[PDB]
């Protein structure tokens, strides 16, 4: 695999925290997301996750 291009790609989908790349919330939560579970309904508040 292209070690340089893949690094140019990871920045688009993940961010490094404590030496490890954490997936970006905005790709993990498409823009039409909502509280899905059997609990409180809520809008797309990725604010808290960030």
């Amino acid at each position: 695999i292209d070690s340089v291009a893949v690094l140019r790609g990871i920045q688009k989908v993940a961010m490094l925290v404590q030496g490890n790349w954490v997936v970006k919330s905005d790709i993990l939560y498409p823009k039409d997301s909502s509280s899905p579970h059997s609990g409180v309904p809520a809008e797309v508040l990725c604010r808290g996750r960030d």
């Binding site: 690094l7 920045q11 490094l16 925290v17 960030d50």
Partner: peptide, 28 residues
């Protein structure tokens, strides 16, 4: 050991993102 790979500019970019989102979250 991500620092073993020579690209220290990445941490600065992540910190710029951190500062931006901090500026967004501090409005609470």
């Amino acid at each position: 050991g991500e620092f073993i790979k020579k690209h220290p500019d990445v941490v600065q970019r992540q910190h710029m993102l951190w500062t931006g989102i901090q500026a967004k979250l501090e409005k609470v």
